[PDB]
Design a protein around this motif. Sequence first.
Motif, PDB file in Angstrom:
ATOM      1  N   UNK A 212       0.837  -1.213   0.000  1.00  9.68           N
ATOM      2  CA  UNK A 212       0.000   0.000   0.000  1.00  9.68           C
ATOM      3  C   UNK A 212       0.875   1.269   0.000  1.00  9.68           C
ATOM      4  N   UNK A 213       0.643   2.144  -0.974  1.00  8.27           N
ATOM      5  CA  UNK A 213       1.372   3.417  -1.076  1.00  8.27           C
ATOM      6  C   UNK A 213       0.477   4.521  -0.573  1.00  8.27           C
ATOM      7  N   UNK A 214       1.085   5.600  -0.095  1.00  9.59           N
ATOM      8  CA  UNK A 214       0.320   6.772   0.308  1.00  9.59           C
ATOM      9  C   UNK A 214       1.034   8.057  -0.115  1.00  9.59           C
ATOM     10  N   UNK A 215       0.247   9.083  -0.384  1.00  4.45           N
ATOM     11  CA  UNK A 215       0.757  10.453  -0.516  1.00  4.45           C
ATOM     12  C   UNK A 215      -0.165  11.337   0.306  1.00  4.45           C
ATOM     13  N   UNK A 216       0.369  12.384   0.933  1.00  2.02           N
ATOM     14  CA  UNK A 216      -0.504  13.198   1.759  1.00  2.02           C
ATOM     15  C   UNK A 216       0.091  14.558   2.027  1.00  2.02           C
ATOM     16  N   UNK A 217      -0.690  15.374   2.719  1.00  2.00           N
ATOM     17  CA  UNK A 217      -0.205  16.647   3.240  1.00  2.00           C
ATOM     18  C   UNK A 217      -0.503  16.710   4.738  1.00  2.00           C
ATOM     19  N   UNK A 218       0.350  17.455   5.449  1.00  2.00           N
ATOM     20  CA  UNK A 218       0.092  17.823   6.852  1.00  2.00           C
ATOM     21  C   UNK A 218       0.291  19.328   6.920  1.00  2.00           C
ATOM     22  N   UNK A 219      -0.708  20.082   7.392  1.00  2.00           N
ATOM     23  CA  UNK A 219      -0.573  21.549   7.426  1.00  2.00           C
ATOM     24  C   UNK A 219       0.358  22.009   8.561  1.00  2.00           C
ATOM     25  N   UNK A 220       0.851  23.251   8.470  1.00  2.00           N
ATOM     26  CA  UNK A 220       1.558  23.851   9.578  1.00  2.00           C
ATOM     27  C   UNK A 220       0.576  23.944  10.753  1.00  2.00           C
ATOM     28  N   UNK A 221       1.011  23.550  11.955  1.00  2.00           N
ATOM     29  CA  UNK A 221       0.056  23.622  13.053  1.00  2.00           C
ATOM     30  C   UNK A 221      -0.396  25.046  13.405  1.00  2.00           C
ATOM     31  N   UNK A 222      -1.651  25.162  13.795  1.00  2.00           N
ATOM     32  CA  UNK A 222      -2.147  26.428  14.323  1.00  2.00           C
ATOM     33  C   UNK A 222      -2.521  26.233  15.790  1.00  2.00           C
ATOM     34  N   UNK A 223      -2.555  27.332  16.553  1.00  2.00           N
ATOM     35  CA  UNK A 223      -2.940  27.271  17.967  1.00  2.00           C
ATOM     36  C   UNK A 223      -4.369  27.765  18.113  1.00  2.00           C
ATOM     37  N   UNK A 224      -5.224  26.970  18.739  1.00  2.00           N
ATOM     38  CA  UNK A 224      -6.565  27.455  19.058  1.00  2.00           C
ATOM     39  C   UNK A 224      -6.525  27.813  20.547  1.00  2.00           C
ATOM     40  N   UNK A 225      -6.671  29.098  20.872  1.00  2.00           N
ATOM     41  CA  UNK A 225      -6.562  29.550  22.277  1.00  2.00           C
ATOM     42  C   UNK A 225      -7.775  29.131  23.127  1.00  2.00           C
ATOM     43  N   UNK A 226      -7.596  29.031  24.470  1.00  2.00           N
ATOM     44  CA  UNK A 226      -8.687  28.705  25.385  1.00  2.00           C
ATOM     45  C   UNK A 226      -9.925  29.568  25.110  1.00  2.00           C
ATOM     46  N   UNK A 227     -11.093  28.929  24.996  1.00  2.00           N
ATOM     47  CA  UNK A 227     -12.366  29.614  24.733  1.00  2.00           C
ATOM     48  C   UNK A 227     -12.598  29.982  23.276  1.00  2.00           C
ATOM     49  N   UNK A 228     -11.565  29.828  22.447  1.00  2.00           N
ATOM     50  CA  UNK A 228     -11.630  30.271  21.039  1.00  2.00           C
ATOM     51  C   UNK A 228     -12.047  29.131  20.104  1.00  2.00           C
ATOM     52  N   UNK A 229     -12.507  29.498  18.913  1.00  2.00           N
ATOM     53  CA  UNK A 229     -12.850  28.533  17.873  1.00  2.00           C
ATOM     54  C   UNK A 229     -11.855  28.734  16.733  1.00  2.00           C
ATOM     55  N   UNK A 230     -11.405  27.632  16.136  1.00  2.00           N
ATOM     56  CA  UNK A 230     -10.488  27.709  15.013  1.00  2.00           C
ATOM     57  C   UNK A 230     -11.059  26.988  13.819  1.00  2.00           C
ATOM     58  N   UNK A 231     -10.592  27.328  12.610  1.00  2.00           N
ATOM     59  CA  UNK A 231     -11.147  26.679  11.415  1.00  2.00           C
ATOM     60  C   UNK A 231     -10.020  26.295  10.479  1.00  2.00           C
ATOM     61  N   UNK A 232     -10.208  25.186   9.774  1.00  2.00           N
ATOM     62  CA  UNK A 232      -9.196  24.629   8.871  1.00  2.00           C
ATOM     63  C   UNK A 232      -9.973  24.139   7.656  1.00  2.00           C
ATOM     64  N   UNK A 233      -9.465  24.413   6.451  1.00  2.00           N
ATOM     65  CA  UNK A 233     -10.198  24.128   5.212  1.00  2.00           C
ATOM     66  C   UNK A 233      -9.302  23.363   4.251  1.00  2.00           C
ATOM     67  N   UNK A 234      -9.907  22.472   3.480  1.00  2.00           N
ATOM     68  CA  UNK A 234      -9.194  21.700   2.449  1.00  2.00           C
ATOM     69  C   UNK A 234     -10.232  21.275   1.438  1.00  2.00           C
ATOM     70  N   UNK A 235      -9.760  20.837   0.272  1.00  2.00           N
ATOM     71  CA  UNK A 235     -10.608  20.251  -0.776  1.00  2.00           C
ATOM     72  C   UNK A 235     -10.070  18.902  -1.218  1.00  2.00           C
ATOM     73  N   UNK A 236     -11.005  17.967  -1.395  1.00  2.00           N
ATOM     74  CA  UNK A 236     -10.729  16.692  -2.051  1.00  2.00           C
ATOM     75  C   UNK A 236     -11.302  16.745  -3.451  1.00  2.00           C
ATOM     76  N   UNK A 237     -10.438  16.598  -4.455  1.00  2.00           N
ATOM     77  CA  UNK A 237     -10.892  16.383  -5.826  1.00  2.00           C
ATOM     78  C   UNK A 237     -11.038  14.901  -5.992  1.00  2.00           C
TER      79      UNK A 237
END
Length: 258
Positions: A212-237
């Motif tokens: 089994x082969x794989x290719x992928x991405x891992x984004x640069x990490x972001x910090x979601x602060x206490x009480x805060x909401x964070x969002x991350x977006x991507x597309x699958x073709x």
Amino acid sequence: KLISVKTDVLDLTINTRGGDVEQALLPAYPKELNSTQPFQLLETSPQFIYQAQSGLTGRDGPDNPANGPRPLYNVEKDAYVLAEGQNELQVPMTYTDAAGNTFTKTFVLKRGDYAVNVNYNVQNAGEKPLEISSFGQLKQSITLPTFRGAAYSTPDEKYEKYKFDTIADNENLNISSKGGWVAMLQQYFATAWIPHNDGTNNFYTANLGNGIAAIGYKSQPVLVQPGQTGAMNSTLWVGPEIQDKMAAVAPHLDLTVD
Ligand SMILES: [Ca+2]
Ligand SMILES: [Ca+2]
Ligand SMILES: [Ca+2]
Ligand SMILES: [Ca+2]
Ligand SMILES: [Ca+2]
């Protein structure tokens, strides 16, 4: 459990443990010349695997296997179908961790569209910042049950193939760039993950064992602060070449089929 997600051009099976696409049929394309059976792009069977995986990794991402079992997301229903009087179909799934943090993963599909948005929302209910990276991985059996293999793009390199034989030889990719995408190719169809963020992405391949082969991405990490909401977006073709739609998703995605 598995859920069904259907539009006019996509028939997806998604596992709620983690939110991987385990099967994808393209109702508009024949499986074989003169067949009326739909083409099967992504597939999970005893003979063959070809899946589109994704999630939240990094220190505090629930899909990081150090953080516990792949998150089992809650859903509203088991079957999602694009309505006649709707342009968009949203498939939101929610997971709460031990600490009370809320992770929402949403698939967004559109009528006639092979680009599937995969977006996250992270609500931090705790006392420490949450460090989160999104990832998308395409994994596939190296040998089947004109180029077939993987590809990627960065703003600098624009197009590069990566052979399944190279991955099988345990010589793998590990490059980092802003923007970019990764893909798996075959005649007339591609699958690709495209991150949408402002950070430096890491693109890689892996030999996952058992052919089994794989290719992928891992984004640069972001910090979601206490009480805060964070969002991350991507597309699958997941589908054939549609020049116009692909160009709006990412530069040079059209080169995957061409
Ligand atoms: Ca642990
Ligand atoms: Ca942990
Ligand atoms: Ca070069
Ligand atoms: Ca090149
Ligand atoms: Ca080259």
